[PDB]
Symmetry: D2
Subunit: 319 residues, 4 copies
């Protein structure tokens, strides 16, 4: 039987007898994602180039997510890559969830039409205090749902919850996210490694040795292939689909890495763990880091568990 | 003034007082590309999954049928077809087209960018049309380019007048001219290759990549990007500058990419944009092919980067 | 604040603390309507005409399959099906839906506006569901409305909270709330019927129409409009006011339009918008049906217009 | 073999060894029609209603046709329902054709989502004078091409030339007009009449009798059906497809009718004649009226020849 994202979530919600607020949030998020997809694919660009005689994509994407979530009546605190401070939803619109998101990840290189994406993580507000930026400082372990929209060769929404990870393809003919992969699990071990090797001169010695083993295996196994889109959503999604390992690790110049914990590392860590994968900073699971700043950075190494465990073996060798 | 692909080509064609055949070919190709884009973005996927109760093959059929019915072609070479396709006599025209209808589709399971690559030749021999008509060096190309099905769909068209970039507006199904007479940066800051073959690299590639990571002149190291889909990687090289490499390795001793419908079209785009494209030993466009699916090593991109690689290549004889 | 169909319905349902079954129903039907709109606008027609080398039946399949799989329905009555469809046991919910999946499609050859009409009832007994559950008077309707596939696609939804109009935005596949809690004009200036059947008119219809063309009170004559597709004509009546008639005559004592999935949903929309809908003898919503495909006369629209017609009808006993 | 509008016109042009200017014009007009269709179907309406936190359609349609034709390098004089004076294309953009068009016919009732359309008629400039409004004052007999786009349940472009009338369906998934009905001809006699009978009180006596014969045939044969969308392009297209008669006739209050000769009546008259139908004012062929004002009105009666002849017989009975 055919299934859609909204029908799927409604069915899960009715099973669990939830109030519907999470369903309202996710449906609102999906409307935003469809509007982002339409703009990213450049519908209406003819009008910008004078066919009859405004916002940058990252600003528009942020406004779409912000406005659809504010008006969902399901959220109270919103953290965006785009905004220095947490956004507090006005009282008459307040609901129970905190949402951290990157509305258009990878858009810095969108001039070359690289895949881009939207990343989100949804938390339940934990106290009855007046909503504040502190409501977003939860460890990823507290996530209620997380995932990403990938605006690639097609548009796909990957949604992770306690019930697992499910993948929905946007059918642009009808504007519906169609369930096409149910309860997906990552391969126990992959054959692809993904990181920016151009910065090898700055690598931590453990990263240098680990990548060297992928290219020059000590036994007679085949060396790993390399892929690095440079857009986190594309690279993580390939890691999910094909297995393997993705790294944006710490080094001496960047002791906490470069990617943002709240709306890049944690949601992808959560997707990976719900798919049977792993996500580490090198020192601990990404989902166990307790944040102190909504824009703080974190190292991240994630993907197939055998690959992440092997990296942890090499990392500990240099510790 | 706004411009579209078809209007651009008609205006160029009328200035040169051509017969119109190339315009008919390219307009037919653009129709196929729009249908490929629609399928790649999964329009109608709900019907496959039961709402009412093969992509590379479809892409090949769209290009083949649209090019056959244009009356502008006589010989068609596709990555999907073991032998050259000979257009039936009543539909025969003067052009030969080599193409990859959906380049990179082996990894489309992960929604990697994909694309269509094409190169267009005038039939040069007066013999009955056959597979040998597609065996001309890339230097003979009349037009070449690619459609990139990325975050948006863009058609890059290279001709003697230069390189022009057209964005597909899906709201109206029109390719809009957005970048005119494009030129690649003289030198870039990104290198692109599958470093997983580092064990098999010849010493020239090994040294060149080492120079990118550990620059001898204390300059900033290059960043690395490798999508693994040639159209995406080459299009980034065009837009941002830098260098793309797919050298030979033990699995691919004559290289991996196909000369006729991957290396030559991209090499032609690069050269028309003021860039370079070499096998290491010679310009890609000077290779005289003997087999329609033969492979070639390729290094291409910004001229200062390709020249720097060639200096390293010369150091190793 | 922007609003969409699914979000609007979820919010009403949560206020009323409903179980969610009606929302699952309406969301599934919306998915079907978007697939119907896409096919009606001929998306993909190039493939039927050979680029790579039924509509009313497809529409029925879309509605049937989305409602069956909604887990919200148990009995489905369609203009397309001789008997009621009984939803298979594991998929059963409490609602009965009568619908016309592509009303007006007999004239779709000329691209006349077409539409989907629906009315939703609660199951009548806890017995095994059967066709008898569809034999309720329109007064029992829980929700009703229509999608109009016109110059744009619009879904009109009537419930106890009133009538709301949602425009399909094809760029994102979302129904946008654009007209809230609509009320029809008290009196219009347009009458709508097939005057080609004047020879068969009941004398009251003849007299009423004469008053529209030759007003006794020296007011302006009404304009005439008759698309011949019920959804288009009824939607114009809602938006602009006036009167729509498909009345009984001596040859068709019960009219031509179907009571369960044409007249009742439109009468319910009309009454929720402050208009009226009569057979001439009684309110459409008060007819108790005995056959799921039975016909009904219908006169509907602005209250002053319908009351004026009813006064003429009473004049002729 | 599949055929599209642009491919069809290129092939006719190459056969006849034309210069290509008419093809550039028609291709430019097609681009405008696709943009009008997208706006008429309300693509992007979510943005007007606040999804992220402007012109009327008839104004936008006029700007689209005007700008695409100006920039086609194929035109010198443009007459539009929207503009009091003819537009004279600036010298650097001038071509040889004069175009009269109604960019969005029927839009007065678009609030109720009635079918609307674009009507066009194309003339060759006849004089060697500097271009002026006078170049648009040619009788419809001089038309080089004419037709219309109907934005109905689907979008269709009907194109009439000397080779006949051809119908192209817009496939929105790919933005191409697909040839679906070749060399179309109207029925010799139909069963539907089309006019606003609400104004019967003001009818010319000939119109009153003809309509009386349709509803009460003297031979007791079956009456005609009635249809009147009130949007000229919708009513005329149904007349072409199903046969019958469409009337917007003269009366004493409107002795020249109300529809406009240059960009409504002539193009529809030209399509009808190329399809083997008829189009009369009552007194003369629509295509033979020599206009003196670019916005002058004409009565029009058109459709199946046997139906138009019967109207003309009744019209003459009433001298
Ligand atoms: O949505 C609902 N209930 C509904 N009742 C009627 C309709 Br219709 S949906 N609950 S929830 O929003 O909390 C929710 C959405 S997924 C999920 C998974 C586990 C637990 C709860 C949830
Ligand atoms: O298209 C035409 N002629 C036309 N006449 C009327 C119309 Br309308 S198009 N010629 S061509 O096909 O050879 C062509 C297409 S780009 C280009 C660039 C250089 C030389 C020739 C060409
Ligand atoms: O949908 C729900 N409740 C929901 N809970 C959570 C989510 Br999320 S939706 N109830 S209902 O289906 O009966 C319904 C839909 S409109 C309407 C109007 C009046 C009464 C009931 C209804
Ligand atoms: O377009 C062309 N010639 C072309 N050359 C190359 C290409 Br490619 S098209 N001629 S025309 O514009 O005058 C034209 C368009 S339909 C038609 C019908 C009859 C006579 C002329 C025409």
């Amino acid at each position: 039987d055919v299934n859609t994202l909204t029908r799927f979530v409604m069915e899960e919600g009715r099973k669990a007898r939830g109030t519907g607020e999470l369903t309202q949030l996710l449906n609102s998020l999906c409307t935003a994602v469809k509007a982002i997809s339409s703009a990213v694919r450049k519908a209406g660009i003819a009008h910008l180039y004078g066919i009859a005689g405004v916002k940058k994509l990252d600003v528009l994407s942020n406004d779409l997510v912000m406005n659809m979530l504010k008006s969902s009546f399901a959220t109270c605190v919103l953290v965006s890559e785009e905004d220095k401070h947490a956004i507090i939803v006005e009282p008459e619109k307040r609901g129970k969830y905190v949402v951290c998101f990157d509305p258009l990840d990878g858009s810095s290189n969108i001039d070359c039409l690289v895949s881009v994406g939207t990343i989100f993580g949804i938390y339940r507000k934990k106290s009855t205090d007046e909503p504040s930026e502190k409501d977003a400082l939860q460890p990823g372990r507290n996530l209620v749902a997380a995932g990403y929209a990938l605006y690639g060769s097609a548009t796909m929404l990957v949604l992770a919850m306690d019930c697992g990870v499910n993948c929905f393809m946007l059918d642009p003919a009808i504007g519906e996210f169609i369930l096409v992969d149910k309860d997906v699990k990552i391969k126990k071990k992959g054959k692809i490694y993904s990181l920016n090797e151009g910065y090898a001169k700055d690598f931590d010695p453990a990263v240098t040795e680990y990548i060297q083993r992928k290219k020059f295996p000590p036994d007679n196994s085949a060396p790993y292939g390399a892929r690095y889109v440079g857009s986190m959503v594309a690279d993580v999604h390939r890691t999910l689909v094909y297995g393997g390992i993705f790294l944006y690790p710490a080094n001496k110049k960047s002791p906490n890495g470069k990617l943002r914990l709240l709306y890049e590392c944690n949601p992808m860590a959560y997707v990976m763990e719900k798919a049977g994968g792993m996500a580490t900073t090198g020192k601990e699971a990404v989902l166990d880091v307790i944040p102190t700043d909504i824009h703080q950075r974190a190292p991240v190494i994630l993907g197939s568990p055998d690959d992440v465990l092997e990296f942890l073996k090499v990392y500990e060798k240099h510790s």
